[PDB]
Amino acid sequence: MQIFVKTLTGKTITLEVEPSDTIENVKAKIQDKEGIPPDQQRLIFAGKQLEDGRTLSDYNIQKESTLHLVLRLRGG
């Protein structure tokens, strides 16, 4: 299923994912496109920050859903 991940600084990328993918999986896929390691990423859906071990299915993220990406930088 295709989803979109939007940063807050203006970038949209596209991903093919599974509904069973964990948020951590999604972060790993994002690193492939964006370079950022998973542990500097936080993902958001429908106003909410998402937890690493939940699946997309758990959050009602489906085909063509849009997530947002923010960075978490220890002292950054």
Short mmCIF file of all heavy atoms in Angstrom, two decimals, unseen atoms left out:
data_model
loop_
_atom_site.label_atom_id
_atom_site.label_comp_id
_atom_site.label_asym_id
_atom_site.label_seq_id
_atom_site.Cartn_x
_atom_site.Cartn_y
_atom_site.Cartn_z
N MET A 1 0.92 -1.23 0.00
CA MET A 1 0.00 0.00 0.00
C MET A 1 0.90 1.21 0.00
O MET A 1 2.01 1.28 0.61
CB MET A 1 -1.07 0.03 1.08
CG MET A 1 -0.84 0.57 2.34
SD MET A 1 -1.83 0.29 3.67
CE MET A 1 -0.79 0.90 4.83
N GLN A 2 0.50 2.22 -0.70
CA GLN A 2 1.32 3.48 -0.77
C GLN A 2 0.90 4.39 0.39
O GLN A 2 -0.27 4.54 0.66
CB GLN A 2 0.99 4.18 -2.07
CG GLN A 2 1.71 5.55 -2.20
CD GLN A 2 1.53 6.18 -3.57
OE1 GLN A 2 2.48 6.17 -4.39
NE2 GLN A 2 0.29 6.61 -3.87
N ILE A 3 1.90 5.02 1.06
CA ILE A 3 1.65 6.13 1.98
C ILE A 3 2.57 7.25 1.61
O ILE A 3 3.52 7.10 0.88
CB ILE A 3 1.85 5.68 3.47
CG1 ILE A 3 3.28 5.32 3.77
CG2 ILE A 3 0.85 4.59 3.82
CD1 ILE A 3 3.54 5.15 5.26
N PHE A 4 2.21 8.40 2.19
CA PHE A 4 3.04 9.58 2.00
C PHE A 4 3.61 9.96 3.41
O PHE A 4 2.96 9.80 4.42
CB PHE A 4 2.26 10.73 1.47
CG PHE A 4 1.54 10.41 0.17
CD1 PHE A 4 0.19 10.08 0.23
CD2 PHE A 4 2.23 10.28 -1.02
CE1 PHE A 4 -0.45 9.74 -0.92
CE2 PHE A 4 1.56 9.94 -2.18
CZ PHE A 4 0.22 9.66 -2.14
N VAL A 5 4.81 10.48 3.39
CA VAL A 5 5.43 10.99 4.67
C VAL A 5 5.85 12.45 4.36
O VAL A 5 6.67 12.64 3.43
CB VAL A 5 6.64 10.13 5.06
CG1 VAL A 5 7.29 10.73 6.34
CG2 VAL A 5 6.20 8.70 5.29
N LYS A 6 5.35 13.39 5.14
CA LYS A 6 5.61 14.79 4.87
C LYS A 6 6.46 15.23 6.04
O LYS A 6 6.08 15.07 7.22
CB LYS A 6 4.28 15.56 4.87
CG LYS A 6 3.35 15.41 3.72
CD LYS A 6 2.13 16.31 3.93
CE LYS A 6 2.45 17.77 4.27
NZ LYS A 6 3.18 18.76 3.44
N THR A 7 7.54 15.91 5.72
CA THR A 7 8.27 16.57 6.78
C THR A 7 7.59 17.89 7.08
O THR A 7 6.79 18.34 6.38
CB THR A 7 9.68 16.85 6.41
OG1 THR A 7 9.70 17.87 5.44
CG2 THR A 7 10.36 15.66 5.91
N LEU A 8 7.96 18.60 8.15
CA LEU A 8 7.33 20.00 8.33
C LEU A 8 8.11 21.09 7.69
O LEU A 8 7.80 22.27 7.82
CB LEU A 8 7.01 20.42 9.77
CG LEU A 8 6.24 19.46 10.53
CD1 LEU A 8 7.13 18.59 11.22
CD2 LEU A 8 5.61 20.00 11.68
N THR A 9 9.14 20.71 6.95
CA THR A 9 9.95 21.68 6.30
C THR A 9 9.84 21.56 4.82
O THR A 9 10.68 21.96 4.03
CB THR A 9 11.40 21.52 6.75
OG1 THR A 9 11.81 20.17 6.49
CG2 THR A 9 11.57 21.91 8.17
N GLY A 10 8.81 20.88 4.45
CA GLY A 10 8.36 21.01 3.06
C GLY A 10 8.48 19.86 2.11
O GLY A 10 8.09 19.99 0.98
N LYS A 11 8.98 18.73 2.55
CA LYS A 11 9.28 17.60 1.72
C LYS A 11 8.15 16.55 1.86
O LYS A 11 7.67 16.31 2.96
CB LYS A 11 10.58 16.95 2.11
CG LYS A 11 11.04 15.84 1.16
CD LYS A 11 12.51 15.42 1.35
CE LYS A 11 12.98 14.72 0.08
NZ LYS A 11 14.43 14.41 0.05
N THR A 12 7.78 15.94 0.77
CA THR A 12 6.83 14.81 0.75
C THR A 12 7.63 13.71 0.09
O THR A 12 8.14 13.90 -1.05
CB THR A 12 5.50 15.04 -0.06
OG1 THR A 12 4.66 15.97 0.71
CG2 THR A 12 4.76 13.67 -0.22
N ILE A 13 7.72 12.51 0.70
CA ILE A 13 8.12 11.34 -0.03
C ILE A 13 6.98 10.35 -0.01
O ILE A 13 6.05 10.42 0.79
CB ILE A 13 9.37 10.63 0.52
CG1 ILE A 13 9.14 10.12 1.98
CG2 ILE A 13 10.60 11.59 0.51
CD1 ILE A 13 10.24 9.31 2.68
N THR A 14 7.18 9.35 -0.85
CA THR A 14 6.32 8.32 -1.11
C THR A 14 6.96 7.01 -0.63
O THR A 14 8.13 6.83 -0.88
CB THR A 14 5.91 8.38 -2.68
OG1 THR A 14 5.24 9.62 -2.99
CG2 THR A 14 5.00 7.39 -3.06
N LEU A 15 6.20 6.11 0.01
CA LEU A 15 6.59 4.74 0.43
C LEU A 15 5.59 3.69 0.07
O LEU A 15 4.48 3.93 0.21
CB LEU A 15 6.84 4.64 1.93
CG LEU A 15 7.86 5.38 2.56
CD1 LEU A 15 7.83 5.24 4.09
CD2 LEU A 15 9.23 5.24 2.05
N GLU A 16 6.09 2.49 -0.26
CA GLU A 16 5.24 1.30 -0.32
C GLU A 16 5.51 0.50 0.94
O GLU A 16 6.66 0.20 1.27
CB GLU A 16 5.58 0.52 -1.67
CG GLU A 16 4.44 -0.39 -2.05
CD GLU A 16 3.13 0.27 -2.53
OE1 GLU A 16 3.05 1.53 -3.15
OE2 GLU A 16 2.14 -0.53 -2.42
N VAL A 17 4.47 0.22 1.61
CA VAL A 17 4.56 -0.41 2.96
C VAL A 17 3.48 -1.51 2.99
O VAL A 17 2.61 -1.59 2.14
CB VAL A 17 4.34 0.61 4.13
CG1 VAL A 17 5.37 1.71 4.16
CG2 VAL A 17 2.98 1.28 4.00
N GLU A 18 3.62 -2.28 4.04
CA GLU A 18 2.56 -3.24 4.45
C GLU A 18 1.75 -2.73 5.64
O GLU A 18 2.37 -2.05 6.51
CB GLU A 18 3.16 -4.62 4.82
CG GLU A 18 4.34 -4.93 3.93
CD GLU A 18 4.74 -6.36 3.91
OE1 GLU A 18 3.94 -7.18 3.40
OE2 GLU A 18 5.88 -6.62 4.38
N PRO A 19 0.42 -3.07 5.73
CA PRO A 19 -0.24 -2.70 6.94
C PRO A 19 0.29 -3.24 8.18
O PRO A 19 0.12 -2.69 9.32
CB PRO A 19 -1.70 -3.07 6.75
CG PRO A 19 -1.79 -3.44 5.40
CD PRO A 19 -0.53 -3.65 4.73
N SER A 20 0.97 -4.39 8.10
CA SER A 20 1.62 -5.03 9.24
C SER A 20 2.92 -4.45 9.59
O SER A 20 3.50 -4.87 10.58
CB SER A 20 1.82 -6.55 8.96
OG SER A 20 2.54 -6.68 7.80
N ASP A 21 3.45 -3.50 8.81
CA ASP A 21 4.70 -2.91 9.15
C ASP A 21 4.56 -2.17 10.50
O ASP A 21 3.61 -1.40 10.72
CB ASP A 21 5.19 -1.93 8.11
CG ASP A 21 5.79 -2.55 6.90
OD1 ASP A 21 6.27 -3.69 7.04
OD2 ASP A 21 5.90 -1.92 5.89
N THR A 22 5.56 -2.34 11.37
CA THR A 22 5.67 -1.52 12.54
C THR A 22 6.09 -0.09 12.16
O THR A 22 6.70 0.15 11.09
CB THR A 22 6.70 -2.08 13.55
OG1 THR A 22 7.95 -2.11 12.91
CG2 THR A 22 6.21 -3.43 14.05
N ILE A 23 5.87 0.84 13.08
CA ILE A 23 6.42 2.20 12.90
C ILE A 23 7.92 2.13 12.78
O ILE A 23 8.50 2.88 11.95
CB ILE A 23 5.91 3.08 14.08
CG1 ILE A 23 4.34 3.18 14.04
CG2 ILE A 23 6.60 4.41 14.13
CD1 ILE A 23 3.76 3.59 12.82
N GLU A 24 8.61 1.30 13.54
CA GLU A 24 10.06 1.17 13.38
C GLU A 24 10.44 0.72 11.99
O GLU A 24 11.44 1.25 11.44
CB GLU A 24 10.62 0.23 14.45
CG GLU A 24 12.11 0.31 14.56
CD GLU A 24 12.60 1.60 15.14
OE1 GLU A 24 11.89 2.36 15.80
OE2 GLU A 24 13.79 1.83 14.99
N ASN A 25 9.70 -0.21 11.41
CA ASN A 25 9.94 -0.58 10.02
C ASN A 25 9.82 0.59 9.10
O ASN A 25 10.70 0.85 8.33
CB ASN A 25 8.94 -1.67 9.52
CG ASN A 25 9.22 -3.04 10.11
OD1 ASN A 25 10.23 -3.28 10.80
ND2 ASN A 25 8.32 -4.00 9.80
N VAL A 26 8.76 1.37 9.27
CA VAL A 26 8.56 2.54 8.44
C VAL A 26 9.75 3.50 8.58
O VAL A 26 10.23 4.05 7.55
CB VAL A 26 7.22 3.16 8.69
CG1 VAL A 26 7.07 4.44 7.87
CG2 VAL A 26 6.10 2.19 8.44
N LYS A 27 10.22 3.71 9.78
CA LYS A 27 11.40 4.56 9.96
C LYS A 27 12.59 4.00 9.21
O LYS A 27 13.39 4.80 8.62
CB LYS A 27 11.74 4.71 11.46
CG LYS A 27 10.68 5.47 12.26
CD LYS A 27 11.24 5.59 13.66
CE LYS A 27 10.64 6.20 14.69
NZ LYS A 27 11.66 6.11 15.88
N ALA A 28 12.79 2.71 9.19
CA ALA A 28 13.89 2.14 8.42
C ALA A 28 13.74 2.39 6.97
O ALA A 28 14.71 2.69 6.25
CB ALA A 28 13.94 0.63 8.73
N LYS A 29 12.54 2.32 6.43
CA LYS A 29 12.27 2.65 5.03
C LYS A 29 12.51 4.08 4.76
O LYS A 29 13.05 4.47 3.68
CB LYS A 29 10.89 2.17 4.68
CG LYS A 29 10.62 0.68 4.65
CD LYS A 29 9.18 0.26 4.42
CE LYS A 29 9.11 -1.20 3.94
NZ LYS A 29 8.28 -2.18 4.58
N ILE A 30 12.15 4.99 5.67
CA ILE A 30 12.42 6.37 5.52
C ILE A 30 13.94 6.65 5.49
O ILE A 30 14.39 7.49 4.69
CB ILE A 30 11.73 7.21 6.65
CG1 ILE A 30 10.24 7.19 6.47
CG2 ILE A 30 12.26 8.62 6.72
CD1 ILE A 30 9.46 7.71 7.66
N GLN A 31 14.72 5.96 6.31
CA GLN A 31 16.16 6.16 6.26
C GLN A 31 16.71 5.84 4.88
O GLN A 31 17.63 6.57 4.44
CB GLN A 31 16.86 5.28 7.30
CG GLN A 31 18.36 5.56 7.36
CD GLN A 31 19.12 4.76 8.36
OE1 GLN A 31 18.65 3.78 8.88
NE2 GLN A 31 20.37 5.13 8.58
N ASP A 32 16.16 4.86 4.22
CA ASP A 32 16.63 4.54 2.87
C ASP A 32 16.52 5.72 1.92
O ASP A 32 17.31 5.84 1.02
CB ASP A 32 15.83 3.37 2.32
CG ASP A 32 16.13 2.11 3.03
OD1 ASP A 32 17.12 2.00 3.75
OD2 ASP A 32 15.26 1.22 2.82
N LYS A 33 15.45 6.53 2.06
CA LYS A 33 15.21 7.71 1.20
C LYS A 33 15.80 8.99 1.72
O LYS A 33 16.05 9.94 0.96
CB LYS A 33 13.80 7.86 0.86
CG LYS A 33 13.31 6.75 0.00
CD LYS A 33 12.01 7.16 -0.66
CE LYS A 33 11.58 6.08 -1.59
NZ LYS A 33 10.33 6.55 -2.40
N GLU A 34 15.90 9.15 2.98
CA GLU A 34 16.24 10.42 3.63
C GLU A 34 17.54 10.42 4.41
O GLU A 34 18.00 11.55 4.73
CB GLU A 34 15.16 10.77 4.68
CG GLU A 34 13.85 11.08 4.14
CD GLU A 34 13.87 12.17 3.08
OE1 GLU A 34 14.34 13.28 3.41
OE2 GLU A 34 13.53 11.83 1.90
N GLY A 35 18.04 9.26 4.79
CA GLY A 35 19.40 9.11 5.41
C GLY A 35 19.36 9.16 6.92
O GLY A 35 20.26 8.66 7.58
N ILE A 36 18.30 9.72 7.50
CA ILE A 36 18.12 10.04 8.91
C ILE A 36 18.01 8.73 9.61
O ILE A 36 17.07 8.01 9.27
CB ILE A 36 16.81 10.87 9.02
CG1 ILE A 36 17.04 12.21 8.30
CG2 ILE A 36 16.50 11.26 10.41
CD1 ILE A 36 15.79 12.92 8.09
N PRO A 37 18.79 8.31 10.71
CA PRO A 37 18.51 6.97 11.32
C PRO A 37 17.25 6.94 12.04
O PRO A 37 16.75 8.12 12.48
CB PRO A 37 19.75 6.84 12.24
CG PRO A 37 20.16 8.22 12.48
CD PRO A 37 19.95 8.97 11.27
N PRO A 38 16.67 5.83 12.27
CA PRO A 38 15.39 5.75 12.90
C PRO A 38 15.30 6.43 14.23
O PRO A 38 14.26 6.97 14.59
CB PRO A 38 15.07 4.28 13.02
CG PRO A 38 15.90 3.70 12.00
CD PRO A 38 17.07 4.50 11.73
N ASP A 39 16.39 6.39 14.97
CA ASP A 39 16.25 6.89 16.32
C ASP A 39 16.24 8.47 16.38
O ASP A 39 15.83 9.01 17.39
CB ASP A 39 17.04 6.05 17.33
CG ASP A 39 18.32 5.95 16.97
OD1 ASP A 39 18.79 6.85 16.23
OD2 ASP A 39 19.10 5.09 17.52
N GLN A 40 16.50 9.22 15.24
CA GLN A 40 16.27 10.70 15.07
C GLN A 40 14.97 10.98 14.38
O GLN A 40 14.74 12.10 13.95
CB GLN A 40 17.36 11.42 14.19
CG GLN A 40 18.66 11.68 14.90
CD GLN A 40 19.81 12.31 14.11
OE1 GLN A 40 20.79 12.79 14.65
NE2 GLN A 40 19.73 12.24 12.83
N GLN A 41 14.11 10.01 14.16
CA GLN A 41 12.82 10.23 13.54
C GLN A 41 11.70 10.05 14.56
O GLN A 41 11.72 9.12 15.35
CB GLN A 41 12.57 9.19 12.44
CG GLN A 41 13.56 9.21 11.30
CD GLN A 41 13.22 8.12 10.30
OE1 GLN A 41 12.00 7.82 10.10
NE2 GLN A 41 14.20 7.49 9.71
N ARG A 42 10.69 10.92 14.45
CA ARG A 42 9.40 10.68 15.09
C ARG A 42 8.33 10.86 14.05
O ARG A 42 8.28 11.81 13.30
CB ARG A 42 9.17 11.73 16.21
CG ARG A 42 10.19 11.64 17.37
CD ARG A 42 10.09 10.32 18.06
NE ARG A 42 11.05 10.24 19.16
CZ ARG A 42 12.28 9.76 19.05
NH1 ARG A 42 12.86 9.33 17.96
NH2 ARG A 42 13.09 9.76 20.17
N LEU A 43 7.43 9.86 14.00
CA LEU A 43 6.33 9.90 12.98
C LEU A 43 5.01 10.21 13.65
O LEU A 43 4.85 9.97 14.84
CB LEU A 43 6.16 8.59 12.22
CG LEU A 43 7.32 8.26 11.33
CD1 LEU A 43 7.40 6.72 11.08
CD2 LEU A 43 7.26 9.17 10.10
N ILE A 44 4.21 10.83 12.87
CA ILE A 44 2.94 11.43 13.34
C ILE A 44 1.81 11.05 12.35
O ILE A 44 1.99 11.07 11.12
CB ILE A 44 3.07 12.95 13.33
CG1 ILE A 44 4.20 13.45 14.25
CG2 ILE A 44 1.74 13.65 13.60
CD1 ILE A 44 4.84 14.67 13.95
N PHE A 45 0.61 10.73 12.91
CA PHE A 45 -0.56 10.53 12.05
C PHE A 45 -1.71 11.10 12.77
O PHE A 45 -1.86 10.93 13.97
CB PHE A 45 -0.86 9.05 11.77
CG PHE A 45 -2.06 8.78 10.94
CD1 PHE A 45 -2.17 9.21 9.69
CD2 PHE A 45 -3.12 8.08 11.45
CE1 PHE A 45 -3.28 8.95 8.90
CE2 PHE A 45 -4.26 7.77 10.71
CZ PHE A 45 -4.30 8.24 9.41
N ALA A 46 -2.48 11.91 11.94
CA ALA A 46 -3.77 12.46 12.52
C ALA A 46 -3.49 13.19 13.87
O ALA A 46 -4.27 13.14 14.79
CB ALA A 46 -4.78 11.36 12.61
N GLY A 47 -2.44 13.98 13.90
CA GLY A 47 -2.13 14.82 15.06
C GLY A 47 -1.37 14.21 16.19
O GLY A 47 -1.09 14.94 17.15
N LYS A 48 -1.06 12.92 16.09
CA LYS A 48 -0.58 12.15 17.13
C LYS A 48 0.79 11.61 16.82
O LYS A 48 0.99 11.02 15.81
CB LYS A 48 -1.56 11.06 17.35
CG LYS A 48 -2.86 11.59 17.98
CD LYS A 48 -3.78 10.52 18.37
CE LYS A 48 -4.25 9.81 17.13
NZ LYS A 48 -5.60 10.31 16.85
N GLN A 49 1.72 11.58 17.76
CA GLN A 49 3.00 10.86 17.60
C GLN A 49 2.78 9.35 17.75
O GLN A 49 1.99 8.84 18.58
CB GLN A 49 3.98 11.41 18.61
CG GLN A 49 5.35 10.78 18.46
CD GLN A 49 6.27 11.30 19.54
OE1 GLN A 49 6.21 12.47 19.95
NE2 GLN A 49 7.14 10.46 20.08
N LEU A 50 3.44 8.60 16.89
CA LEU A 50 3.28 7.16 16.79
C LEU A 50 4.37 6.39 17.53
O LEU A 50 5.53 6.83 17.58
CB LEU A 50 3.27 6.76 15.35
CG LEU A 50 2.26 7.56 14.49
CD1 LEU A 50 2.36 7.12 13.01
CD2 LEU A 50 0.87 7.51 15.01
N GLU A 51 4.05 5.26 18.06
CA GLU A 51 4.90 4.43 18.90
C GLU A 51 5.60 3.31 17.97
O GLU A 51 4.94 2.69 17.17
CB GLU A 51 4.10 3.78 20.02
CG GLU A 51 3.54 4.72 21.12
CD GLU A 51 2.36 4.17 21.88
OE1 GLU A 51 2.09 2.92 21.93
OE2 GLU A 51 1.60 4.99 22.50
N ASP A 52 6.88 3.07 18.22
CA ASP A 52 7.72 2.19 17.42
C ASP A 52 7.12 0.84 17.16
O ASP A 52 7.26 0.27 16.03
CB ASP A 52 9.05 1.96 18.07
CG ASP A 52 9.98 3.08 17.91
OD1 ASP A 52 9.83 3.93 17.04
OD2 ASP A 52 11.07 3.00 18.65
N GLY A 53 6.52 0.16 18.14
CA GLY A 53 6.10 -1.21 18.01
C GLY A 53 4.70 -1.44 17.47
O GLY A 53 4.32 -2.56 17.25
N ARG A 54 3.92 -0.35 17.32
CA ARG A 54 2.60 -0.49 16.78
C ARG A 54 2.70 -0.68 15.27
O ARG A 54 3.69 -0.22 14.65
CB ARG A 54 1.75 0.76 17.02
CG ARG A 54 1.58 1.30 18.43
CD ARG A 54 0.82 0.38 19.35
NE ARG A 54 1.57 -0.82 19.62
CZ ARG A 54 2.55 -0.91 20.54
NH1 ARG A 54 3.07 0.20 21.22
NH2 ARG A 54 3.15 -2.05 20.66
N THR A 55 1.71 -1.31 14.68
CA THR A 55 1.64 -1.38 13.23
C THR A 55 0.82 -0.26 12.65
O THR A 55 0.04 0.40 13.30
CB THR A 55 1.08 -2.72 12.80
OG1 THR A 55 -0.29 -2.73 13.16
CG2 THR A 55 1.82 -3.87 13.38
N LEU A 56 1.01 -0.11 11.32
CA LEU A 56 0.19 0.88 10.62
C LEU A 56 -1.28 0.60 10.81
O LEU A 56 -2.08 1.50 11.07
CB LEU A 56 0.61 0.92 9.17
CG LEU A 56 2.01 1.38 8.92
CD1 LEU A 56 2.29 1.32 7.44
CD2 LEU A 56 2.30 2.83 9.39
N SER A 57 -1.66 -0.70 10.68
CA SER A 57 -3.03 -1.19 10.86
C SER A 57 -3.59 -0.71 12.22
O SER A 57 -4.76 -0.30 12.35
CB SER A 57 -3.11 -2.80 10.82
OG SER A 57 -4.46 -3.16 10.78
N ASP A 58 -2.77 -0.71 13.27
CA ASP A 58 -3.17 -0.30 14.63
C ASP A 58 -3.61 1.15 14.77
O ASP A 58 -4.37 1.48 15.65
CB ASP A 58 -2.07 -0.60 15.65
CG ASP A 58 -1.73 -2.07 15.86
OD1 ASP A 58 -2.54 -3.01 15.62
OD2 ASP A 58 -0.49 -2.37 16.35
N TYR A 59 -3.09 1.99 13.87
CA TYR A 59 -3.40 3.37 13.82
C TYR A 59 -4.41 3.75 12.73
O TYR A 59 -4.64 4.92 12.50
CB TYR A 59 -2.08 4.17 13.65
CG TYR A 59 -1.24 4.19 14.87
CD1 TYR A 59 0.04 3.72 14.85
CD2 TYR A 59 -1.71 4.89 16.00
CE1 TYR A 59 0.84 3.85 15.94
CE2 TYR A 59 -0.90 4.96 17.19
CZ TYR A 59 0.37 4.54 17.13
OH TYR A 59 1.21 4.65 18.22
N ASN A 60 -4.96 2.75 12.06
CA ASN A 60 -5.90 3.07 10.91
C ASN A 60 -5.14 3.77 9.75
O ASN A 60 -5.77 4.60 9.00
CB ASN A 60 -7.19 3.78 11.44
CG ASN A 60 -7.88 3.06 12.53
OD1 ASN A 60 -8.13 3.62 13.57
ND2 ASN A 60 -8.25 1.85 12.31
N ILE A 61 -3.88 3.55 9.59
CA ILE A 61 -3.14 4.09 8.48
C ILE A 61 -3.36 3.07 7.32
O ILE A 61 -3.07 1.88 7.49
CB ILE A 61 -1.67 4.21 8.82
CG1 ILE A 61 -1.53 5.32 9.93
CG2 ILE A 61 -0.83 4.52 7.63
CD1 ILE A 61 -0.22 5.22 10.69
N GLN A 62 -3.82 3.60 6.23
CA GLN A 62 -4.24 2.79 5.08
C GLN A 62 -3.71 3.39 3.80
O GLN A 62 -2.89 4.25 3.81
CB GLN A 62 -5.69 2.54 5.19
CG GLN A 62 -6.49 3.72 4.99
CD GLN A 62 -8.00 3.43 4.74
OE1 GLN A 62 -8.62 2.45 5.30
NE2 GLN A 62 -8.60 4.28 4.04
N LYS A 63 -4.23 2.84 2.70
CA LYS A 63 -3.78 3.29 1.47
C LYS A 63 -4.00 4.79 1.37
O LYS A 63 -4.99 5.35 1.66
CB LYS A 63 -4.63 2.54 0.37
CG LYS A 63 -6.16 2.88 0.44
N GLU A 64 -2.92 5.42 0.93
CA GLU A 64 -2.81 6.87 0.65
C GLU A 64 -2.86 7.73 1.83
O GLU A 64 -3.00 8.95 1.70
CB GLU A 64 -3.79 7.34 -0.49
CG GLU A 64 -3.87 6.51 -1.69
CD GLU A 64 -2.64 6.25 -2.38
OE1 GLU A 64 -1.71 7.03 -2.30
OE2 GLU A 64 -2.44 5.12 -2.92
N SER A 65 -2.75 7.18 3.04
CA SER A 65 -2.63 7.98 4.23
C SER A 65 -1.34 8.78 4.19
O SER A 65 -0.33 8.37 3.61
CB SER A 65 -2.60 7.10 5.50
OG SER A 65 -3.82 6.47 5.75
N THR A 66 -1.44 9.96 4.87
CA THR A 66 -0.33 10.87 4.97
C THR A 66 0.16 10.89 6.43
O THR A 66 -0.60 11.17 7.31
CB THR A 66 -0.67 12.28 4.44
OG1 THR A 66 -0.86 12.30 3.04
CG2 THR A 66 0.56 13.17 4.68
N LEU A 67 1.43 10.56 6.63
CA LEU A 67 2.08 10.74 7.92
C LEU A 67 2.94 11.98 7.85
O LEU A 67 3.24 12.49 6.78
CB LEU A 67 2.94 9.51 8.19
CG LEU A 67 2.15 8.27 8.68
CD1 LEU A 67 1.15 7.77 7.66
CD2 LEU A 67 3.17 7.23 9.04
N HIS A 68 3.35 12.44 9.08
CA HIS A 68 4.36 13.54 9.14
C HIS A 68 5.56 13.05 9.88
O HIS A 68 5.50 12.14 10.67
CB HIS A 68 3.76 14.77 9.85
CG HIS A 68 2.62 15.35 9.10
ND1 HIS A 68 2.74 16.46 8.31
CD2 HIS A 68 1.40 14.96 9.02
CE1 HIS A 68 1.57 16.77 7.80
NE2 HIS A 68 0.73 15.83 8.19
N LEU A 69 6.69 13.63 9.55
CA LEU A 69 8.01 13.27 10.10
C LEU A 69 8.61 14.53 10.73
O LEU A 69 8.72 15.55 10.05
CB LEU A 69 8.93 12.76 9.04
CG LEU A 69 10.43 12.57 9.39
CD1 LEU A 69 10.65 11.48 10.39
CD2 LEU A 69 11.32 12.32 8.17
N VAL A 70 9.03 14.36 11.99
CA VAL A 70 9.83 15.41 12.68
C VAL A 70 11.09 14.76 13.20
O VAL A 70 11.16 13.54 13.42
CB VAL A 70 9.02 16.10 13.70
CG1 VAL A 70 8.73 15.18 14.78
CG2 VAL A 70 9.66 17.16 14.36
N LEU A 71 12.13 15.58 13.38
CA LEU A 71 13.38 15.08 13.86
C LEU A 71 13.49 15.24 15.35
O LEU A 71 13.00 16.22 15.93
CB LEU A 71 14.53 15.77 13.25
CG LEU A 71 14.57 15.59 11.73
CD1 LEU A 71 15.77 16.29 11.21
CD2 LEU A 71 14.34 14.08 11.28
N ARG A 72 14.15 14.30 16.04
CA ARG A 72 14.44 14.37 17.49
C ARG A 72 15.92 14.21 17.58
O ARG A 72 16.47 13.13 17.34
CB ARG A 72 13.63 13.35 18.25
CG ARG A 72 14.00 13.12 19.71
CD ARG A 72 13.57 14.31 20.49
NE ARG A 72 14.01 14.37 21.91
CZ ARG A 72 15.03 15.11 22.39
NH2 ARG A 72 15.85 15.88 21.63
N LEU A 73 16.56 15.32 17.93
CA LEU A 73 17.97 15.44 17.94
C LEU A 73 18.47 15.77 19.38
O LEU A 73 18.24 16.79 19.80
CB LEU A 73 18.44 16.57 16.91
CG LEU A 73 17.93 16.60 15.38
CD1 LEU A 73 18.24 17.78 14.45
CD2 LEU A 73 18.31 15.35 14.56
N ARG A 74 19.09 14.80 20.05
CA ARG A 74 19.57 14.99 21.42
C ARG A 74 20.51 16.18 21.33
O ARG A 74 21.45 16.19 20.48
CB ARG A 74 20.31 13.70 21.88
CG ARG A 74 20.97 13.80 23.27
CD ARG A 74 20.51 12.71 24.26
NE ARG A 74 20.68 13.25 25.62
CZ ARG A 74 21.84 13.31 26.29
NH1 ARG A 74 22.93 12.82 25.74
NH2 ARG A 74 21.95 13.86 27.51
N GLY A 75 20.14 17.25 22.04
CA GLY A 75 20.92 18.46 21.90
C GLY A 75 21.08 19.15 20.51
O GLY A 75 21.98 19.97 20.23
N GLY A 76 20.21 18.81 19.58
CA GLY A 76 20.33 19.34 18.21
C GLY A 76 19.35 20.48 18.01
O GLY A 76 18.61 20.99 18.94
#
